Design a protein around this nucleic acid. Structure first.
Ligand SMILES: [Mg+2]
Ligand SMILES: [Mg+2]
Ligand SMILES: [Mg+2]
Ligand SMILES: [Mg+2]
Ligand SMILES: [Mg+2]
Ligand SMILES: [Mg+2]
Ligand SMILES: [Mg+2]
Ligand SMILES: [Mg+2]
Ligand SMILES: [Mg+2]
Ligand SMILES: [Mg+2]
Ligand SMILES: [Mg+2]
Ligand SMILES: [Mg+2]
Ligand SMILES: [Mg+2]
Ligand SMILES: [Mg+2]
Ligand SMILES: [Mg+2]
Ligand SMILES: [Mg+2]
Ligand SMILES: [Mg+2]
Ligand SMILES: [Mg+2]
Ligand SMILES: [Mg+2]
Ligand SMILES: [Mg+2]
Ligand SMILES: [Mg+2]
Ligand SMILES: [Mg+2]
Ligand SMILES: [Mg+2]
Ligand SMILES: [Mg+2]
Ligand SMILES: [Mg+2]
Ligand SMILES: [Mg+2]
Ligand SMILES: [Mg+2]
Ligand SMILES: [Mg+2]
Ligand SMILES: [Mg+2]
Ligand SMILES: [Mg+2]
Ligand SMILES: [Mg+2]
Ligand SMILES: [Mg+2]
Ligand SMILES: [Mg+2]
Ligand SMILES: [Mg+2]
Ligand SMILES: [Mg+2]
Ligand SMILES: [Mg+2]
Ligand SMILES: [Mg+2]
Ligand SMILES: [Mg+2]
Ligand SMILES: [Mg+2]
Ligand SMILES: [Mg+2]
Ligand SMILES: [Mg+2]
Ligand SMILES: [Mg+2]
Ligand SMILES: [Mg+2]
Ligand SMILES: [Mg+2]
Ligand SMILES: [Mg+2]
Ligand SMILES: [Mg+2]
Ligand SMILES: [Mg+2]
Ligand SMILES: [Mg+2]
Ligand SMILES: [Mg+2]
Ligand SMILES: [Mg+2]
Ligand SMILES: [Mg+2]
Ligand SMILES: [Mg+2]
Ligand SMILES: [Mg+2]
Ligand SMILES: [Mg+2]
Ligand SMILES: [Mg+2]
Ligand SMILES: [Mg+2]
Ligand SMILES: [Mg+2]
Ligand SMILES: [Mg+2]
Ligand SMILES: [Mg+2]
Ligand SMILES: [Mg+2]
Ligand SMILES: [Mg+2]
Ligand SMILES: [Mg+2]
Ligand SMILES: [Mg+2]
Ligand SMILES: [Mg+2]
Ligand SMILES: [Mg+2]
Ligand SMILES: [Mg+2]
Ligand SMILES: [Mg+2]
Ligand SMILES: [Mg+2]
Ligand SMILES: [Mg+2]
Ligand SMILES: [Mg+2]
Ligand SMILES: [Mg+2]
Ligand SMILES: [Mg+2]
Ligand SMILES: [Mg+2]
Ligand SMILES: [Mg+2]
Ligand SMILES: [Mg+2]
Ligand SMILES: [Mg+2]
Ligand SMILES: [Mg+2]
Ligand SMILES: [Mg+2]
Ligand SMILES: [Mg+2]
Ligand SMILES: [Mg+2]
Ligand SMILES: [Mg+2]
Ligand SMILES: [Mg+2]
Ligand SMILES: [Mg+2]
Ligand SMILES: [Mg+2]
Ligand SMILES: [Mg+2]
Ligand SMILES: [Mg+2]
Ligand SMILES: [Mg+2]
Ligand SMILES: [Mg+2]
Ligand SMILES: [Mg+2]
Ligand SMILES: [Mg+2]
Ligand SMILES: [Mg+2]
Ligand SMILES: [Mg+2]
Ligand SMILES: [Mg+2]
Ligand SMILES: [Mg+2]
Ligand SMILES: [Mg+2]
Ligand SMILES: [Mg+2]
Ligand SMILES: [Mg+2]
Ligand SMILES: [Mg+2]
Ligand SMILES: [Mg+2]
Ligand SMILES: [Mg+2]
Ligand SMILES: [Mg+2]
Ligand SMILES: [Mg+2]
Ligand SMILES: [Mg+2]
Ligand SMILES: [Mg+2]
Ligand SMILES: [Mg+2]
Ligand SMILES: [Mg+2]
Ligand SMILES: [Mg+2]
Ligand SMILES: [Mg+2]
Ligand SMILES: [Mg+2]
Ligand SMILES: [Mg+2]
Ligand SMILES: [Mg+2]
Ligand SMILES: [Mg+2]
Ligand SMILES: [Mg+2]
Ligand SMILES: [Mg+2]
Ligand SMILES: [Mg+2]
Ligand SMILES: [Mg+2]
Ligand SMILES: [Mg+2]
Ligand SMILES: [Mg+2]
Ligand SMILES: [Mg+2]
Ligand SMILES: [Mg+2]
Ligand SMILES: [Mg+2]
Ligand SMILES: [Mg+2]
Ligand SMILES: [Mg+2]
Ligand SMILES: [Mg+2]
Ligand SMILES: [Mg+2]
Ligand SMILES: [Mg+2]
Ligand SMILES: [Mg+2]
Ligand SMILES: [Mg+2]
Ligand SMILES: [Mg+2]
Ligand SMILES: [Mg+2]
Ligand SMILES: [Mg+2]
Ligand SMILES: [Mg+2]
Ligand SMILES: [Mg+2]
Ligand SMILES: [Mg+2]
Ligand SMILES: [Mg+2]
Ligand SMILES: [Mg+2]
Ligand SMILES: [Mg+2]
Ligand SMILES: [Mg+2]
Ligand SMILES: [Mg+2]
Ligand SMILES: [Mg+2]
Ligand SMILES: [Mg+2]
Ligand SMILES: [Mg+2]
Ligand SMILES: [Mg+2]
Ligand SMILES: [Mg+2]
Ligand SMILES: [Mg+2]
Ligand SMILES: [Mg+2]
Ligand SMILES: [Mg+2]
Ligand SMILES: [Mg+2]
Ligand SMILES: [Mg+2]
Ligand SMILES: [Mg+2]
Ligand SMILES: [Mg+2]
Ligand SMILES: [Mg+2]
Ligand SMILES: [Mg+2]
Ligand SMILES: [Mg+2]
Ligand SMILES: [Mg+2]
Ligand SMILES: [Mg+2]
Ligand SMILES: [Mg+2]
Ligand SMILES: [Mg+2]
Ligand SMILES: [Mg+2]
Ligand SMILES: [Mg+2]
Ligand SMILES: [Mg+2]
Ligand SMILES: [Mg+2]
Ligand SMILES: [Mg+2]
Ligand SMILES: [Mg+2]
Ligand SMILES: [Mg+2]
Ligand SMILES: [Mg+2]
Ligand SMILES: [Mg+2]
Ligand SMILES: [Mg+2]
Ligand SMILES: [Mg+2]
Lengths: 48, 92
RNA sequence: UAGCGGGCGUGGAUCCCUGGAUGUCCGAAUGGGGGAACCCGGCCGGCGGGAACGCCGGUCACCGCGCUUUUUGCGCGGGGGGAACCUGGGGAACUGAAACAUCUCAGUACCCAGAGGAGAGGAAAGAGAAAUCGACUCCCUGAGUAGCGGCGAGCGAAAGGGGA
RNA sequence: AGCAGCGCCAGAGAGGGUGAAAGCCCCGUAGGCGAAAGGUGGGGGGAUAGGUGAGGGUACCCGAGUACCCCGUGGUUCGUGGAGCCAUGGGGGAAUCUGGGCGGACCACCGCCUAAGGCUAAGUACUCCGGGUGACCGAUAGCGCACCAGUACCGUGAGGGAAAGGUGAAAAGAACCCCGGGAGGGGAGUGAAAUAGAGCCUGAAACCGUGGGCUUACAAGCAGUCACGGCCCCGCAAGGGGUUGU
RNA sequence: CAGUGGAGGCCCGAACCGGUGGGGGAUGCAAACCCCUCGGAUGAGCUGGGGCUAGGAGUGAAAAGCUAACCGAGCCCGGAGA
RNA sequence: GCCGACCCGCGAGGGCGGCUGGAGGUAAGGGAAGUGCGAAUGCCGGCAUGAGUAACGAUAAAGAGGGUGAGAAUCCCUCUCGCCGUAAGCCCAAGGGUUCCUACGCAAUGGUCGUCAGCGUAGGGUUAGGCGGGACCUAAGGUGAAGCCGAAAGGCGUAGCCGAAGGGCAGCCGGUUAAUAUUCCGGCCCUUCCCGCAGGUGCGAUGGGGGGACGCUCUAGGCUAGGGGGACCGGAGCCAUGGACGAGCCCGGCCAGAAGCGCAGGGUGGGAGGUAGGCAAAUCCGCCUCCCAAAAGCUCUGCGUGGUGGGGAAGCCCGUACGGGUGACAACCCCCCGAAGCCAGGGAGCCAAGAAAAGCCUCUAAGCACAACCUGCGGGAACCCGUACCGCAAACCGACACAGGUGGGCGGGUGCAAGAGCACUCAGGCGCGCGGGAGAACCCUCGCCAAGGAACUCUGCAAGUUGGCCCCGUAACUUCGGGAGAAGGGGUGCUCCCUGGGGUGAUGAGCUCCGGGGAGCCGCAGUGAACAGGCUCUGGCGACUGUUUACCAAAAACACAGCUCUCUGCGAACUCGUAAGAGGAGGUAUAGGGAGCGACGCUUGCCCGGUGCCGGAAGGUCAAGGGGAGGGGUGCAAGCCCCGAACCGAAGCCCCGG
């Protein structure tokens, strides 16, 4: 039955993407923490 | 900056296949136009290219111990030299 | 970091400090776009036979201030980051009060802007009772005092004195 | 490097390492020396910007939507209180030293200070960074991370978030033969040691197994305890240990 | 009246959408499945792709349903050792 | 650390001895604390129990010979058997990300096995002006110079810019690799850009105009895909087992293709004058006037043809692999069925009234007219990204080689009234990655049953009966449509004979589509298998189709067309927002918001005391504020300061009425 994860890349990137995060003060802090924690991936990756 | 687009020849039965016809395929630099692979191999093997073909070679992922790898990407270009011409340099 | 294959060092190699060079692409990211690391350009040079095509070097974001003849211009600056500290704008609730509403938690948590090796504050329209003191900040003290308080729970100074 | 014998150094007997336990072997330690280059640097020196007089007259100036007053609030120890002071959203709205503000309503006296422009180091705060020290941890501790960890993995995402250190002094890492497809072993060999043989120091417990001793198929059970007895074992015996029949 | 015509939240019935009854499953094939049966099926239809709306908020042919497998107030981190 | 039957201590402990261990330890006497664990459904780890138990993931299904190999139920090959075949085959898109192909290999992964693999190691493998996307357009939306708003962060937003499965745009057939192919190659055919030239024209755009440019349902003509038959064309072969050497059987008889020609369609009025409009730029468009042709012409597209290129079976030898030969010098032709596709912007009807923008064409402005546009030809130029493989699944989403989920295209034949249904079957693909036996209860799915036939039971739950098509026939009631598939019946196969009509051809034969009449044959039974309604009567609720509690409720609940009330005059009421603003609505009372009722029929009574709402210029109370008699504090005073009566002061409430 339709589960919940229905991958689509435009979506992934348009929504949790980097350009996207920088766009809003909210996402900016996210990048900020992400980086200050030392995450390797600052945002989901997308092979398309 | 010209012997830089050409990287090394690709060596493969399939590469050889087309030496017989007019077709020399080699590893080029990944950011190279066909417009440049042209003026490149042209000023490099003193031939005239009538036709360049390209394709990326997504690099396979190898590994070792726990350490999980990823081979570098590449870009074969394959050049069709003016009729009759040849490149002894490659025909070994 | 052994190995295969080759080299270099007293004509001071490796290596360590200092300055310089180079430094693709993305990122404030700034020629334009964009789904970051990709795509597409204008201008002036250059490269290939080179007009068409491609590449190479330079250059072109926006805002503020100053100068300039409206203007086109020209220069100086800004933008983003930073563990904690700091300052300004905004600002809770659990909780305590053995319910709860004033009150408390607390101007705390946090959000936002800014500052910087600190930041604030700072040379009295002051203190407050001595005809005295003499900017500001910090520590000790004064003091759990003075007071504040559904005079509940609680909260809680200053002057002065000793110091930096 | 222990033990022994005889020596020496010390402005150095902090500490570390070397096959174990070293002042004298090694690196250090005490003491002392050093920068072409970049950074720092009034601490010392020099220079510049600036700055400094007494009396008399004059009544020109001395920070405006400001003082001030009232309404609404904030700050302060101050919760509307007798409620000032500082600050200011709304309304009215001055003066220039016969000016103004304050000294907790208000008034009089006395006294203090000069608002409505700005700047100012030090003393202070913190710790990403470097170092030093610990009646601080020693791999379930200490940072989440001693290890390739903000990883693997988990979540669309914000985000969550592990596990995992140790052969030996030296790799000397076990040629070679043997069984096996391999794995793994048995010999040989190295080593002080190989049940130190490679997730290899030590190697506890649960848990699984092999061998041996005592025991059990008419027997009733919180599993033990008390007694006697048989068997087995240690001791010459007196004794003790194991087992368990009643 | 006959002809022609070809309307309709019309009828039967696949795809497709759905879940009526029963059986099965119940450490499942499966954190909602299977079989038989059944409802709609030119419409208030089903559907791919691109978009917008969210936490006292959205969305709701209204069940307090849905809002990333538990929603009478989502998830995360924080206040927090309430 | 391990052992002890010894010693000391009341005990927690300490000591001693043996074995292991192999580099630290820390008296006496004091000090300091992360200081003693059996329990917290405690936290971490390890290891047990259940138990060799349940399971091994669709009941589509196996068997044998040969080969490989240390080892085969499980890998390769062969034959037989079975299952799918609107799929369980084939091609796209998404997601996935090397899973593709080779070679070597089996520790683990694989629910068993594994020599195999989608697994480990390594090497190869993805080629484009023309396919898709970008150097094109615009949609919702997003962003956003201006501008507006907000304590900050930020919100809204014009132009513009971004945004696609929509608009526009030039490639078809065939061959080749182990693995790519409108991408390489072969053949035929195109597109832009630049340069030179020929000819031609007022050229020129971002601006004006045309066009692009549109719904649903039904539908004509012609054609193609696709499919069937052929005694005709080609073909290696076959005569079995009683018969057949034949109009026998079996196989195959296509694909692309420019110009031109043909067939079928779409598009399009032509000429002249005047013009105040398309934000006074126009020869264009619009609008008025008259004349002509009423159709052609011109323009475009589909098909057929077409120089020529290609391909081309069964069967047989070689063959693990997989193809290559044979295999023809192949033939390549007739007839029929025929689309939902094509011509395409076709036609008709309907009401719910059916994107934009660029390309393209045209008009002019600035500017140029040695330019520049336009047409032909010649020569040159033509980038970036994707291209493997999986793709209804063992490669995507579901922790799994999970019976679930996933958009578009193709989806053959025969039969059944039709069909994408059903049964069987091509092509193609599979037998679902544990087997072997046995033939107990019991469970599941399924078959049948004497007599009875609802006695079962909460309930005919479940099963069963019925079932398609054709003809006969069919009631209350009704809103005249219905109720109807009411009910109940009869027919249905096969053979011969007579015959009616439609289609293509030509009017005929052949092919095909739908029938009507008689005669007869067999069986228990003729929609002989599979698909396939049991029926009636009478209450309740709800008018009706719809909606719903994703995962225990599908209903009598919600919704609904319709009715009434009420608000709202437009900068509307109302809603979201602090605001700007937006929605309402580019709507205007035949409208919009709220509320209740809920097709339709007939109807809807009385009670305004209380509550709400509506009305009520009186009165009553009523805050700030205004007012200031009167009183106070202080000063020597001028003053300063405070308190304060009457009186004026909204809405609300009271009151009055609906
Ligand atoms: Mg791999
Ligand atoms: Mg430089
Ligand atoms: Mg850059
Ligand atoms: Mg950029
Ligand atoms: Mg360019
Ligand atoms: Mg250039
Ligand atoms: Mg030249
Ligand atoms: Mg510049
Ligand atoms: Mg001048
Ligand atoms: Mg900064
Ligand atoms: Mg702080
Ligand atoms: Mg309380
Ligand atoms: Mg309490
Ligand atoms: Mg309490
Ligand atoms: Mg603050
Ligand atoms: Mg700074
Ligand atoms: Mg300092
Ligand atoms: Mg300072
Ligand atoms: Mg300051
Ligand atoms: Mg001063
Ligand atoms: Mg001051
Ligand atoms: Mg003094
Ligand atoms: Mg009290
Ligand atoms: Mg306080
Ligand atoms: Mg000091
Ligand atoms: Mg100090
Ligand atoms: Mg001596
Ligand atoms: Mg030592
Ligand atoms: Mg030196
Ligand atoms: Mg020195
Ligand atoms: Mg100093
Ligand atoms: Mg001097
Ligand atoms: Mg001077
Ligand atoms: Mg004087
Ligand atoms: Mg004021
Ligand atoms: Mg005052
Ligand atoms: Mg206060
Ligand atoms: Mg106050
Ligand atoms: Mg009070
Ligand atoms: Mg005062
Ligand atoms: Mg004020
Ligand atoms: Mg006083
Ligand atoms: Mg006085
Ligand atoms: Mg530090
Ligand atoms: Mg440190
Ligand atoms: Mg740890
Ligand atoms: Mg551990
Ligand atoms: Mg660390
Ligand atoms: Mg995951
Ligand atoms: Mg070795
Ligand atoms: Mg050995
Ligand atoms: Mg030998
Ligand atoms: Mg083998
Ligand atoms: Mg080994
Ligand atoms: Mg030892
Ligand atoms: Mg041992
Ligand atoms: Mg081993
Ligand atoms: Mg091991
Ligand atoms: Mg052991
Ligand atoms: Mg014994
Ligand atoms: Mg006995
Ligand atoms: Mg014994
Ligand atoms: Mg009809
Ligand atoms: Mg219908
Ligand atoms: Mg129906
Ligand atoms: Mg569908
Ligand atoms: Mg539903
Ligand atoms: Mg149900
Ligand atoms: Mg059950
Ligand atoms: Mg739709
Ligand atoms: Mg909420
Ligand atoms: Mg969660
Ligand atoms: Mg708290
Ligand atoms: Mg010991
Ligand atoms: Mg000690
Ligand atoms: Mg002590
Ligand atoms: Mg403790
Ligand atoms: Mg403890
Ligand atoms: Mg305990
Ligand atoms: Mg329990
Ligand atoms: Mg067990
Ligand atoms: Mg059993
Ligand atoms: Mg079993
Ligand atoms: Mg099975
Ligand atoms: Mg079957
Ligand atoms: Mg078999
Ligand atoms: Mg063989
Ligand atoms: Mg063999
Ligand atoms: Mg053999
Ligand atoms: Mg279907
Ligand atoms: Mg792999
Ligand atoms: Mg392939
Ligand atoms: Mg294996
Ligand atoms: Mg296995
Ligand atoms: Mg499995
Ligand atoms: Mg094999
Ligand atoms: Mg093998
Ligand atoms: Mg094999
Ligand atoms: Mg071509
Ligand atoms: Mg380009
Ligand atoms: Mg505006
Ligand atoms: Mg655009
Ligand atoms: Mg195209
Ligand atoms: Mg393929
Ligand atoms: Mg192929
Ligand atoms: Mg000429
Ligand atoms: Mg013109
Ligand atoms: Mg002109
Ligand atoms: Mg134009
Ligand atoms: Mg135009
Ligand atoms: Mg236009
Ligand atoms: Mg237009
Ligand atoms: Mg359209
Ligand atoms: Mg045909
Ligand atoms: Mg045909
Ligand atoms: Mg013939
Ligand atoms: Mg015969
Ligand atoms: Mg046949
Ligand atoms: Mg046959
Ligand atoms: Mg005709
Ligand atoms: Mg005109
Ligand atoms: Mg005129
Ligand atoms: Mg004109
Ligand atoms: Mg004209
Ligand atoms: Mg003209
Ligand atoms: Mg035709
Ligand atoms: Mg043709
Ligand atoms: Mg033809
Ligand atoms: Mg022909
Ligand atoms: Mg011909
Ligand atoms: Mg040309
Ligand atoms: Mg491909
Ligand atoms: Mg599936
Ligand atoms: Mg999965
Ligand atoms: Mg399977
Ligand atoms: Mg589907
Ligand atoms: Mg079909
Ligand atoms: Mg199976
Ligand atoms: Mg029977
Ligand atoms: Mg019976
Ligand atoms: Mg009977
Ligand atoms: Mg009977
Ligand atoms: Mg009975
Ligand atoms: Mg009953
Ligand atoms: Mg039933
Ligand atoms: Mg029957
Ligand atoms: Mg009936
Ligand atoms: Mg029949
Ligand atoms: Mg004819
Ligand atoms: Mg039926
Ligand atoms: Mg009744
Ligand atoms: Mg009745
Ligand atoms: Mg009714
Ligand atoms: Mg219904
Ligand atoms: Mg439900
Ligand atoms: Mg509006
Ligand atoms: Mg409006
Ligand atoms: Mg509107
Ligand atoms: Mg309207
Ligand atoms: Mg009536
Ligand atoms: Mg009534
Ligand atoms: Mg009156
Ligand atoms: Mg009086
Ligand atoms: Mg008096
Ligand atoms: Mg008096
Ligand atoms: Mg007076
Ligand atoms: Mg009066
Ligand atoms: Mg009034
Ligand atoms: Mg009144």
């Amino acid at each position: 039955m339709k589960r919940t994860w229905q991958p689509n890349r435009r979506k992934r990137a348009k929504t949790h993407g980097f350009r996207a995060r920088m766009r809003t003060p909210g996402g900016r802090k996210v990048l900020k923490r992400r980086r200050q924690k030392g995450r390797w991936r600052l945002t989901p990756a997308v092979r398309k | 900056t010209a012997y830089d687009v050409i990287l090394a020849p690709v060596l493969s039965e399939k590469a050889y296949a087309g030496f017989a016809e007019g077709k020399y395929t080699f590893w080029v630099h990944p950011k190279a136009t066909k417009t440049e692979i042209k003026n490149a191999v042209e000023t490099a093997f003193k031939v005239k290219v009538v036709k360049v073909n390209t394709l990326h070679v997504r690099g396979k992922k190898k590994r070792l111990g726990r350490y999980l790898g990823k081979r570098p990407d590449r870009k074969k270009a394959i050049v069709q030299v003016a009729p009759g011409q040849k490149i002894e340099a490659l025909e070994g």
